Design a protein around this ligand. Structure first.
Ligand SMILES: CC(=O)N1c2ccc(-c3cnc(C(N)=O)nc3)cc2N(Cc2ccccc2CO)C[C@@H]1C1CC1
Length: 113
């Protein structure tokens, strides 16, 4: 549905990396939408108004929902922010989020322009 812009190509590369086996040890909690019912997190949707995850970002990229790199970045950061909002700062999943966000932020900073 049309070639991605040069900056969105970079974003797509980053997304591929975040989903790759390379980072699976800490990326796995972010692969799919939080299933609040299944995990017994019955307050999750009261606290997190805009859930986000990497599969949703992937779908949006494929569907050309993102019009620029900034919109893509906002969803990725929304995902991490949701994790930092819902979970205590000493939780294992928060440590994983910080590590995956480090991967994201450092490569996002290498955006071509
Ligand atoms: C994305 C996010 O904020 N969350 C999060 C999202 C998804 C999953 C997850 C759990 N199980 C499976 C599975 N069954 O394969 N896949 C993903 C787990 C979490 N963790 C739990 C969790 C993460 C990592 C290590 C240990 C645990 C303790 O169980 C909590 C949190 C949550 C409180 C909001």
């Amino acid at each position: 549905m049309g070639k991605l812009s040069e900056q969105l190509k970079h974003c797509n590369g980053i997304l591929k990396e975040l989903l790759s086996k390379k980072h699976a040890a800490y990326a796995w909690p972010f692969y799919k939408p939080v299933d609040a019912s299944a995990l017994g997190l019955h307050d999750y949707h009261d606290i997190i108004k805009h859930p986000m995850d990497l599969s949703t970002v992937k779908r949006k990229m494929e569907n050309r929902d993102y019009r620029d790199a900034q919109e893509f970045a906002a969803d990725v950061r929304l995902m991490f922010s949701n994790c930092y909002k819902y979970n205590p700062p000493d939780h294992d999943v928060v440590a994983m989020a910080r590590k995956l966000q480090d991967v994201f932020e450092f490569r996002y900073a290498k955006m071509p322009d």
